[PDB]
mmCIF file of C-alpha atoms and ligand atoms in Angstrom:
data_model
loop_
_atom_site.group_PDB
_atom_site.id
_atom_site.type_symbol
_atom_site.label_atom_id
_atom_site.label_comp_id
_atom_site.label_asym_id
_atom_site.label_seq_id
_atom_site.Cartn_x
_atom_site.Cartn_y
_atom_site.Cartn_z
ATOM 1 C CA UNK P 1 138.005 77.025 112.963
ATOM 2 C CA UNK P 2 136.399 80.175 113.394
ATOM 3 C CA UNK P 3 138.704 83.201 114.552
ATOM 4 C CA UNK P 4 141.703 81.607 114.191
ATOM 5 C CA UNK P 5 144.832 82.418 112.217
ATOM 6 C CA UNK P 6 146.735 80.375 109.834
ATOM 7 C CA UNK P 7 149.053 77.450 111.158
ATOM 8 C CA UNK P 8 152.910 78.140 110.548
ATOM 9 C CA UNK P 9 154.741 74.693 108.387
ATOM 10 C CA UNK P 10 155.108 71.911 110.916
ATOM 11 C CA UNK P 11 152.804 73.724 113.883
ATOM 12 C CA UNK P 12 151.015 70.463 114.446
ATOM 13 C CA UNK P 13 152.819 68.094 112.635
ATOM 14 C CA UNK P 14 150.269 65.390 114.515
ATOM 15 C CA UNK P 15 147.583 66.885 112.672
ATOM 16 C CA UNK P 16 145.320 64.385 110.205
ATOM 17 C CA UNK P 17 142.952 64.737 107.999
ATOM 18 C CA UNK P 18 139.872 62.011 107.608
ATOM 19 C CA UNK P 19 139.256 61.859 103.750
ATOM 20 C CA UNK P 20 136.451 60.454 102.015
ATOM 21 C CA UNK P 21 137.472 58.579 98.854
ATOM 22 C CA UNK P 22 133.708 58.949 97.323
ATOM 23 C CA UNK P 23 133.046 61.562 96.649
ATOM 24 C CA UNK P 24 136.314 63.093 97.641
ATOM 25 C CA UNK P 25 135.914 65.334 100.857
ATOM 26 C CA UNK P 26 136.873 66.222 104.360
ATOM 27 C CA UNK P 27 135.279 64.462 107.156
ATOM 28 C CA UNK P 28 136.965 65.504 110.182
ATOM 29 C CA UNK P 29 140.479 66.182 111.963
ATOM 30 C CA UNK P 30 142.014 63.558 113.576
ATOM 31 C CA UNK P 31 145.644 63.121 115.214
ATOM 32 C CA UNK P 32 148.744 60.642 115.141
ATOM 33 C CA UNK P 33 149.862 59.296 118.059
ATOM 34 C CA UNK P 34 152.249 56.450 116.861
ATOM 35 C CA UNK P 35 154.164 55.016 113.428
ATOM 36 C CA UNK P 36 150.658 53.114 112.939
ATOM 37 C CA UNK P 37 147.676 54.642 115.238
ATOM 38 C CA UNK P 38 145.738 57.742 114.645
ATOM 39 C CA UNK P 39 142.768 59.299 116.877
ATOM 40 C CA UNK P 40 139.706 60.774 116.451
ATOM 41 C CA UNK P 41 136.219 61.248 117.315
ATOM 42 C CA UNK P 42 133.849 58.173 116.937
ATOM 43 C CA UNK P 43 130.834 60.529 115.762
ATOM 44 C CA UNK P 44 132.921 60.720 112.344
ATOM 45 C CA UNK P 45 132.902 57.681 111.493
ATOM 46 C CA UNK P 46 129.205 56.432 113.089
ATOM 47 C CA UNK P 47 126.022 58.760 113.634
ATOM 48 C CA UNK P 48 123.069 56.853 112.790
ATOM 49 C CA UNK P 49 121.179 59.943 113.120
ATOM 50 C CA UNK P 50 123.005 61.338 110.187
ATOM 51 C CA UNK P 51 122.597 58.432 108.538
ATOM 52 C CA UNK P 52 126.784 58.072 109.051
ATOM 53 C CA UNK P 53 128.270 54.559 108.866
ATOM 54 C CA UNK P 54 131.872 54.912 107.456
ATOM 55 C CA UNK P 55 133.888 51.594 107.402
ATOM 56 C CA UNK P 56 138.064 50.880 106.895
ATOM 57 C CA UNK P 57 137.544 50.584 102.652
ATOM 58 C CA UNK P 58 135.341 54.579 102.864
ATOM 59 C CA UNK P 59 138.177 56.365 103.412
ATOM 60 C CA UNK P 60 141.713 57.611 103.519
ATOM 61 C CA UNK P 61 143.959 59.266 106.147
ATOM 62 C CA UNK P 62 146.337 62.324 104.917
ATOM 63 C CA UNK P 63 149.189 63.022 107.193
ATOM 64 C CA UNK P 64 151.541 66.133 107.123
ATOM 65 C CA UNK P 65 149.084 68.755 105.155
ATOM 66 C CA UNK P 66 149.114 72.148 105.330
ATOM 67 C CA UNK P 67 147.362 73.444 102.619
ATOM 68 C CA UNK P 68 143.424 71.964 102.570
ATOM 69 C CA UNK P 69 142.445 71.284 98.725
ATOM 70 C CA UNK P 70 146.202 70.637 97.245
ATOM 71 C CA UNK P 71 147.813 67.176 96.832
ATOM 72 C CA UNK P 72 151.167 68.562 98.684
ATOM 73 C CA UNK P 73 153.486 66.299 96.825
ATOM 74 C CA UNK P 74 156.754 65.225 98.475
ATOM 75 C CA UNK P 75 155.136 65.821 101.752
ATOM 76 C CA UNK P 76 152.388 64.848 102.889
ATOM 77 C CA UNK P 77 151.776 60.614 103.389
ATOM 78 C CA UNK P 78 148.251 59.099 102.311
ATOM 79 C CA UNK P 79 147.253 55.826 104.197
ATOM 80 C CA UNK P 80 144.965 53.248 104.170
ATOM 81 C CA UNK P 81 142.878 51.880 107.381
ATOM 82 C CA UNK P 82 143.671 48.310 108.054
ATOM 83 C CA UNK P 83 140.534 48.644 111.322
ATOM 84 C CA UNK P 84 138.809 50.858 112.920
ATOM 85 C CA UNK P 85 137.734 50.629 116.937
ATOM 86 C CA UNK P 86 134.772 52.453 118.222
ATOM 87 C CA UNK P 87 134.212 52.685 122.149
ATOM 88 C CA UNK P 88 131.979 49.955 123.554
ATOM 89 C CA UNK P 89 129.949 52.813 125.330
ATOM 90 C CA UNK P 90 130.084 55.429 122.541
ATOM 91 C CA UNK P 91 126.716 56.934 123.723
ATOM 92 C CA UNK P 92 125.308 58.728 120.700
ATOM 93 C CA UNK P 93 121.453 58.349 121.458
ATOM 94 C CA UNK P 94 122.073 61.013 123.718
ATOM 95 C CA UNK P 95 124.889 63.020 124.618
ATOM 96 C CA UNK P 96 127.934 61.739 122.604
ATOM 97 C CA UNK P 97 129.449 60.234 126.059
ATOM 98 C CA UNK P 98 133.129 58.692 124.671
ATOM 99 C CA UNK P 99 133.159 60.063 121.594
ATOM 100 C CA UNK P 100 136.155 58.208 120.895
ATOM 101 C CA UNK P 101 137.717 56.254 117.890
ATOM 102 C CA UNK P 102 141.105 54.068 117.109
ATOM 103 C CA UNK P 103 142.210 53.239 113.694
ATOM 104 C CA UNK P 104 145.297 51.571 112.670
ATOM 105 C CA UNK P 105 147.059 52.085 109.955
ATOM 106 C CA UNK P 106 147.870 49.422 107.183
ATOM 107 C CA UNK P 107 151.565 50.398 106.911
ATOM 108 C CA UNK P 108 153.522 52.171 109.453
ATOM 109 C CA UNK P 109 153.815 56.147 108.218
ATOM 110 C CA UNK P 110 157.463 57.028 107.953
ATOM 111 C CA UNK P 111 158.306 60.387 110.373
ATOM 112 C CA UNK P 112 159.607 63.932 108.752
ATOM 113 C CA UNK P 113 159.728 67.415 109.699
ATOM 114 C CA UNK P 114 155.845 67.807 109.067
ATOM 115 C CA UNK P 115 154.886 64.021 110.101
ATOM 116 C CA UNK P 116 155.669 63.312 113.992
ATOM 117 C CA UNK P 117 153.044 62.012 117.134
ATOM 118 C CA UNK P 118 151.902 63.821 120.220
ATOM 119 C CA UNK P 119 152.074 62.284 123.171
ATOM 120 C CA UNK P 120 149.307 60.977 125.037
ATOM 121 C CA UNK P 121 148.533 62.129 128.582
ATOM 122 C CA UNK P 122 149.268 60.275 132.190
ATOM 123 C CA UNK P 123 147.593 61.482 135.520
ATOM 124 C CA UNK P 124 149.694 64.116 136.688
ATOM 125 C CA UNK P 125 150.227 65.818 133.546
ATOM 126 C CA UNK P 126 146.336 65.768 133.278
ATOM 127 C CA UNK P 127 145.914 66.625 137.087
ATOM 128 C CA UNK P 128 148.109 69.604 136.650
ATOM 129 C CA UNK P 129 147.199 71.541 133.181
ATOM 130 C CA UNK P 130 143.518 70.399 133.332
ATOM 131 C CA UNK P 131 142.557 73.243 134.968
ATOM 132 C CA UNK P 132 140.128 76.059 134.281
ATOM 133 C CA UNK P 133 141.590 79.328 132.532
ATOM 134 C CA UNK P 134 144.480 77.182 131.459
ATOM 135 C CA UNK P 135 144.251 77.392 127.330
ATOM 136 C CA UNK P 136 144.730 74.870 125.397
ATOM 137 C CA UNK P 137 145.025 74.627 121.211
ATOM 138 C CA UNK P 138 142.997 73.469 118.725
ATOM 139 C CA UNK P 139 143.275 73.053 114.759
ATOM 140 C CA UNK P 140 141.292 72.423 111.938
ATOM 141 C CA UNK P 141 140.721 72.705 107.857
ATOM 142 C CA UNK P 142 137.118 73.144 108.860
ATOM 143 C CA UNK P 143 134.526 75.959 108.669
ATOM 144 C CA UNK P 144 135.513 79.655 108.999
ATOM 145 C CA UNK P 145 132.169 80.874 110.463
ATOM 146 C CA UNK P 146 128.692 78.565 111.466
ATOM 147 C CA UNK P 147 127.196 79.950 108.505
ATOM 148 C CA UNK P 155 133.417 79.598 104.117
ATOM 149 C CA UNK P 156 136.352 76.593 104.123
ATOM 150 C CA UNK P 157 140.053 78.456 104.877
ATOM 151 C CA UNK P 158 143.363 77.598 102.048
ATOM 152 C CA UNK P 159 145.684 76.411 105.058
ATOM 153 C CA UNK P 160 145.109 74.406 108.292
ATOM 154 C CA UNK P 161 144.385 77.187 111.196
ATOM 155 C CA UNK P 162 144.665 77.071 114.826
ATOM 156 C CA UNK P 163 142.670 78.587 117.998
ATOM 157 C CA UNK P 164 144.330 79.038 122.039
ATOM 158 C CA UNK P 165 141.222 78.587 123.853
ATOM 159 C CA UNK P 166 140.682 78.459 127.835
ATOM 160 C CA UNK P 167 139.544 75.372 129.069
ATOM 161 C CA UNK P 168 135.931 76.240 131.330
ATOM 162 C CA UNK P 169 134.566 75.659 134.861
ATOM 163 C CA UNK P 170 132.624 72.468 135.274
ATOM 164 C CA UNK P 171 129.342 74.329 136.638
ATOM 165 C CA UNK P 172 129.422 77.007 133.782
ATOM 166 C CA UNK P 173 129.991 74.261 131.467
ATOM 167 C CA UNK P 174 126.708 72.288 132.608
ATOM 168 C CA UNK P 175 124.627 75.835 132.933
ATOM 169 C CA UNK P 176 124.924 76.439 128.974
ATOM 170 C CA UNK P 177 122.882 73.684 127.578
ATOM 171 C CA UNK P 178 120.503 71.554 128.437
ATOM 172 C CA UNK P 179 122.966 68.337 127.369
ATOM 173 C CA UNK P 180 123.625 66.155 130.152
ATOM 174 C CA UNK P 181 127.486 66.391 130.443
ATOM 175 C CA UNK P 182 129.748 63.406 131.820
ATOM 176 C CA UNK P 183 133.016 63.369 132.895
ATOM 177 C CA UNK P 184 134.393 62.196 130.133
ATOM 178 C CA UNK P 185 133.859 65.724 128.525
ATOM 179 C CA UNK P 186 135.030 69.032 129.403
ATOM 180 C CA UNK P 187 134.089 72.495 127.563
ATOM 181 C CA UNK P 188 136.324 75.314 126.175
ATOM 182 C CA UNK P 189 136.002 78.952 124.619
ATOM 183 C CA UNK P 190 135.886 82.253 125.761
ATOM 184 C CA UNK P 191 133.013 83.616 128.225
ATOM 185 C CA UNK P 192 130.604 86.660 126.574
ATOM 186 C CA UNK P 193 132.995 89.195 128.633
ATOM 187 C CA UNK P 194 136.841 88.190 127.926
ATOM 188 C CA UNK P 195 136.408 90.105 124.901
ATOM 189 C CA UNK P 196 138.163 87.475 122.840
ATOM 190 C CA UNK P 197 136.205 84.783 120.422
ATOM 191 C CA UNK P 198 137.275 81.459 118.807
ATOM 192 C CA UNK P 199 135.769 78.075 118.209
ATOM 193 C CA UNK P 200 135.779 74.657 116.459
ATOM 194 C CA UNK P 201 132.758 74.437 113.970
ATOM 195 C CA UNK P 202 131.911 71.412 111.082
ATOM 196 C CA UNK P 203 134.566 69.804 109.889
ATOM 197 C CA UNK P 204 137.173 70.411 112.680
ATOM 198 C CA UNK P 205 135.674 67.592 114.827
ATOM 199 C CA UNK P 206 137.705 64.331 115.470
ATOM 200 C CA UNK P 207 140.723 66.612 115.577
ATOM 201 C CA UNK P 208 143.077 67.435 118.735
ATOM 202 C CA UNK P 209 143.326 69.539 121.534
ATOM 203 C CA UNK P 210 146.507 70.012 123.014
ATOM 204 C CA UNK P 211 148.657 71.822 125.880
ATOM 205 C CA UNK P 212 152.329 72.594 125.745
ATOM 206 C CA UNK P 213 153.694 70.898 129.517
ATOM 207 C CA UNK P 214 156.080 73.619 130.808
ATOM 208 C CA UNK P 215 157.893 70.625 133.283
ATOM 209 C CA UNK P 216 159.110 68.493 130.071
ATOM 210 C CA UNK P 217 158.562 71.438 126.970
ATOM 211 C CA UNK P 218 156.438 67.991 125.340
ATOM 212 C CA UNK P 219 153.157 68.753 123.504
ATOM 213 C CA UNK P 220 150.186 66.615 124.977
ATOM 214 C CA UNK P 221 146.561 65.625 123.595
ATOM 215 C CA UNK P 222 144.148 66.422 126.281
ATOM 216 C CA UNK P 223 141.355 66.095 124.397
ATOM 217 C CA UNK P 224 139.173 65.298 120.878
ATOM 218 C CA UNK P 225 137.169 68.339 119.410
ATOM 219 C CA UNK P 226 133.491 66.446 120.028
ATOM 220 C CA UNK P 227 130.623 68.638 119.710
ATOM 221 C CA UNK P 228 128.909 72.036 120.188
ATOM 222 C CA UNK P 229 125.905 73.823 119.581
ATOM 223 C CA UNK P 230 126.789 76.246 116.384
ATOM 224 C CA UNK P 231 129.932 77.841 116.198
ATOM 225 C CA UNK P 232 131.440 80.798 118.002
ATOM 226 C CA UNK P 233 127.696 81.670 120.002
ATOM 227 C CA UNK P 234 127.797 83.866 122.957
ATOM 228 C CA UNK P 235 127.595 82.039 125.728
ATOM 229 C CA UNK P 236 127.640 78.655 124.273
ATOM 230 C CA UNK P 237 130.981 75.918 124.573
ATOM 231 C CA UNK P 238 132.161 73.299 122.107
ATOM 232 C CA UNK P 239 132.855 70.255 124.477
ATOM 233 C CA UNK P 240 135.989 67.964 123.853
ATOM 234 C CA UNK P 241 136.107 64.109 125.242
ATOM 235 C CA UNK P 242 138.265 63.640 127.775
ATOM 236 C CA UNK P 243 141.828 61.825 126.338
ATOM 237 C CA UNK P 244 143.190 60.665 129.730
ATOM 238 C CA UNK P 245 139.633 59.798 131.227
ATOM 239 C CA UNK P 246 139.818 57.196 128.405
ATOM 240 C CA UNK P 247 143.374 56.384 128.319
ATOM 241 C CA UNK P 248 143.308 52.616 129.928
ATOM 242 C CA UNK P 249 140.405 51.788 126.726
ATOM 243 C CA UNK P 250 143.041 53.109 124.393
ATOM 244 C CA UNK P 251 146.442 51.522 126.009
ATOM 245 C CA UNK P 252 144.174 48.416 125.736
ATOM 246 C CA UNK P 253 143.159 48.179 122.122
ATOM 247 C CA UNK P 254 146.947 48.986 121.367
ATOM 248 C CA UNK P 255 148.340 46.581 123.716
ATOM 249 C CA UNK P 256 145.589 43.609 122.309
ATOM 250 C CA UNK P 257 145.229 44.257 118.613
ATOM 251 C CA UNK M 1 136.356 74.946 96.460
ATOM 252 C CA UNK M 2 136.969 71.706 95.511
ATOM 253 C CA UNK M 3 139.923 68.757 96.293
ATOM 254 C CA UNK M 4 142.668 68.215 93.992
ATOM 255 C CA UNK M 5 143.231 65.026 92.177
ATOM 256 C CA UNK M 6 145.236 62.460 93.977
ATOM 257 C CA UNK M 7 147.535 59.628 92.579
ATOM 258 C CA UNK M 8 145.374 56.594 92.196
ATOM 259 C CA UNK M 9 147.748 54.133 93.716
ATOM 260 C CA UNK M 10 145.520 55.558 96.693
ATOM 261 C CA UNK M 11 142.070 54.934 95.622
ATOM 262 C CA UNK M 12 142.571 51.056 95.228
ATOM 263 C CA UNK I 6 156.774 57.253 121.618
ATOM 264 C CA UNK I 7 160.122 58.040 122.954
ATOM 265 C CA UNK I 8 160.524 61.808 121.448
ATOM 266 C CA UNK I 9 156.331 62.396 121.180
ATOM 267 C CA UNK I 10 155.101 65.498 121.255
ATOM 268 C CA UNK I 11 158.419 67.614 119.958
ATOM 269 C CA UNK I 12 158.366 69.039 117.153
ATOM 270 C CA UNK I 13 160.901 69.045 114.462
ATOM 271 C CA UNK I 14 161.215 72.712 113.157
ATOM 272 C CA UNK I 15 160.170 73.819 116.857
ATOM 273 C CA UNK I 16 161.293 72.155 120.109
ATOM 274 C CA UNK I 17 163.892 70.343 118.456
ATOM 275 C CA UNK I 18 166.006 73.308 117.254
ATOM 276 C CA UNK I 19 164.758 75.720 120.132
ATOM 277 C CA UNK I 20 162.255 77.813 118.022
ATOM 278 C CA UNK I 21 159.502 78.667 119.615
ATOM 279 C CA UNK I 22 156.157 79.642 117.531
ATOM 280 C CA UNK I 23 154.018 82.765 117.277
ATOM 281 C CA UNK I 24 151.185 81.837 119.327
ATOM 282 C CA UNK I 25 152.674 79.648 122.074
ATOM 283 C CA UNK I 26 153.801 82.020 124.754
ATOM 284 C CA UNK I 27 150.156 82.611 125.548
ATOM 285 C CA UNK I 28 149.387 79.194 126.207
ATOM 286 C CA UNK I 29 152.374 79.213 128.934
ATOM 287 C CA UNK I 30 151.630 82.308 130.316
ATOM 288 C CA UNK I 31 147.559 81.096 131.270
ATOM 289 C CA UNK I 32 149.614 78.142 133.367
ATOM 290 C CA UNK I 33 149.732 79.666 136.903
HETATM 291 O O1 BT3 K 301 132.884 73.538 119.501
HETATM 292 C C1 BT3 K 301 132.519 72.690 118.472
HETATM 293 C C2 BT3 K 301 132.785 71.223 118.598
HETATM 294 C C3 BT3 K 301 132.231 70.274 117.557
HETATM 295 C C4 BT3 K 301 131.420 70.777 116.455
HETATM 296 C C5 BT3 K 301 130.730 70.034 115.448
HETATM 297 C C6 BT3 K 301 130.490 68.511 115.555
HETATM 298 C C7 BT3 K 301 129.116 67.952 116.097
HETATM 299 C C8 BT3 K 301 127.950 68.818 116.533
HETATM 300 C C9 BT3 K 301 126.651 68.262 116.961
HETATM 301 C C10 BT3 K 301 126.414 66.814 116.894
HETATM 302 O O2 BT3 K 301 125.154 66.253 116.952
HETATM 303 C C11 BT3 K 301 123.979 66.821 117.591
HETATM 304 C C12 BT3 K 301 124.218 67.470 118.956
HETATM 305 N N1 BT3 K 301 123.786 66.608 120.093
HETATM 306 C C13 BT3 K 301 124.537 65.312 119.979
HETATM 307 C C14 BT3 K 301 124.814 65.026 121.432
HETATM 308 C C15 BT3 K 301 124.834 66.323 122.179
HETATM 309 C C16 BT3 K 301 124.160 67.391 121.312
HETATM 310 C C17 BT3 K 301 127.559 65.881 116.594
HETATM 311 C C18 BT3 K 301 128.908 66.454 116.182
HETATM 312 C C19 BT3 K 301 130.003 70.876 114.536
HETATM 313 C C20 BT3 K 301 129.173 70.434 113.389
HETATM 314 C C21 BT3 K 301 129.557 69.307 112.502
HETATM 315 C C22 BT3 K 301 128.608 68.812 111.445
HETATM 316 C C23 BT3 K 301 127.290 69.587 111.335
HETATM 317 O O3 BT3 K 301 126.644 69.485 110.172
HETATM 318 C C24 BT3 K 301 125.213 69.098 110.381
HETATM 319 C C25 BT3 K 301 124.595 68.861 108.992
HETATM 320 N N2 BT3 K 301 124.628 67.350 108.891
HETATM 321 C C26 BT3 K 301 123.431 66.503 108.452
HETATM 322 C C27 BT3 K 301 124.151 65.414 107.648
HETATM 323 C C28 BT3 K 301 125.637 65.781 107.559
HETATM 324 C C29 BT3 K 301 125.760 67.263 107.880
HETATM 325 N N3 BT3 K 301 126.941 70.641 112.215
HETATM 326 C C30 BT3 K 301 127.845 71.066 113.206
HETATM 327 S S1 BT3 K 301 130.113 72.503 115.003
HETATM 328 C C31 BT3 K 301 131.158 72.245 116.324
HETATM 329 C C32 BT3 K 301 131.702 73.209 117.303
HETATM 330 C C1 NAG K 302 127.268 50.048 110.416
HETATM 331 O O1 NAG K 302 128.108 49.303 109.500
HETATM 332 C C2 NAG K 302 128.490 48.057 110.122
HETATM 333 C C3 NAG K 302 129.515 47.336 109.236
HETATM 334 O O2 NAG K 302 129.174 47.320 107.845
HETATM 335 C C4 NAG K 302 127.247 47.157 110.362
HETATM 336 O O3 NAG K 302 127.614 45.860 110.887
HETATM 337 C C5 NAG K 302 126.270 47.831 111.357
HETATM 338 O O4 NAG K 302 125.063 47.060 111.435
HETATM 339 C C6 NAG K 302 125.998 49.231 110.749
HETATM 340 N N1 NAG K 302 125.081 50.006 111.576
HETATM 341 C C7 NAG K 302 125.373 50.327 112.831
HETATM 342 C C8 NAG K 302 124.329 51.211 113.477
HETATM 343 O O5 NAG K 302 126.393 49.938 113.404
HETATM 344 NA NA1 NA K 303 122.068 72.637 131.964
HETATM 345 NA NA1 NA K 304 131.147 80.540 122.481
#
């Protein structure tokens, strides 16, 4: 995250980390959204053009961090993947269209003060705070600036962006399974994702029911914290019936 | 810098 | 999930954190 602040304890207590067991490292934020299912962007795990190909026995999940490097013993949960579940129509020959992953969890993760879901969208709650100027939140262990790695998860508010402004800042095709966020060259204000914050959640406090919701999955962006440039996020409830039905099959 | 070492009952 | 999305140290004891006010406040 660049321009952000640190997290308080249990801020985002949805919050993964993807962890590569060799060599040990971060890969990319991710979020829990049940006892057994976490969510995160499909680019982390498969990106041919980065030569990426991660499957279930590459890597580990760590739930309930705070701090980035330090095994936080006592409270934080390490899991293993049982399978993971790219989109069908993860598009990334060209524009990253459903950048969007499942992976369940071999045993169910046990809830705490630090360790607790976020709730997934339906169509009014997305009809209602989807809207441009509303800001949203996003957190990460990534990188501090484009061009280093923070102690403690941090978080970013960010406005979510009109479609047409969106489009006019790269020369990306968009879909409508993405949106973009960050501040315009004249708010005056500055925050962004950048490498290693990807996969992870972005999410808007509902003032009707006070619940936290995941509207969307940090997916990509050109550098990190440019004038006049966006980082786009896939579009949760867009996807929603794809997810309810891996769940509800497997 | 770099990770800290984690219990191996999670790299098997 | 039944309680998703609340918190522990936060919505469940009516604490509210340092940053979240703005969020509300951008919700016209
Ligand atoms: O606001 C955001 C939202 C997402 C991201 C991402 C993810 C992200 C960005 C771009 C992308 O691919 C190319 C972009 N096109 C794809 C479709 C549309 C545009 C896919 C994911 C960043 C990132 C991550 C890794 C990387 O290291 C490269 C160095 N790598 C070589 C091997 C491993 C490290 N460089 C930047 S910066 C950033 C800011
Ligand atoms: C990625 O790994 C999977 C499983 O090992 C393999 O079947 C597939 O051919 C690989 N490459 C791509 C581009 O999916
Ligand atoms: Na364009
Ligand atoms: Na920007």
């Amino acid at each position: 995250i660049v321009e952000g602040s640190d997290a308080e304890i249990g801020m985002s207590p949805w919050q993964v980390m993807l962890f590569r067991k060799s060599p040990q490292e971060l890969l990319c934020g991710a979020s829990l959204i049940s006892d057994r299912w976490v969510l995160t962007a499909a680019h982390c795990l498969l990106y041919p053009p980065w030569d990426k190909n991660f499957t279930e026995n590459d890597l580990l999940v760590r739930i309930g961090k705070h701090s980035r490097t330090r095994y936080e013993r006592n409270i934080e949960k390490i899991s293993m993947l049982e399978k993971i579940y790219i989109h069908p129509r993860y598009n990334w020959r060209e524009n990253l269209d459903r950048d969007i992953a499942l992976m369940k969890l071999k045993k169910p993760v046990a809830f705490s003060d630090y360790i607790h879901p976020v709730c997934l969208p339906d169509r009014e709650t997305a009809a209602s705070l989807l809207q441009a100027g509303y800001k949203g939140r996003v957190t990460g262990w990534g990188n501090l600036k484009e061009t280093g790695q923070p102690s403690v998860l941090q978080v970013v508010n960010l406005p979510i962006v009109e479609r047409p402004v969106c489009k006019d800042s790269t020369r990306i095709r968009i879909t409508d399974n993405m949106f973009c966020a960050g501040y315009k060259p004249d708010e005056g204000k500055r925050g962004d994702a950048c490498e290693g914050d990807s996969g992870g959640p972005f999410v808007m406090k509902s003032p009707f029911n006070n619940r936290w919701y995941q509207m969307g999955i940090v997916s990509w962006g050109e550098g990190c914290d440019r004038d006049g440039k966006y980082g786009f996020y896939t579009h949760v409830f867009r996807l929603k019936k794809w997810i309810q039905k891996v769940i509800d099959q497997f | 810098g770099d990770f800290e070492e984690i219990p191996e009952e999670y790299l098997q | 999930e039944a309680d998703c999305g609340l918190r522990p140290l936060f919505e469940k004891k009516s604490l509210e954190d340092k940053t979240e006010r703005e969020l509300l406040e951008s919700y016209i």
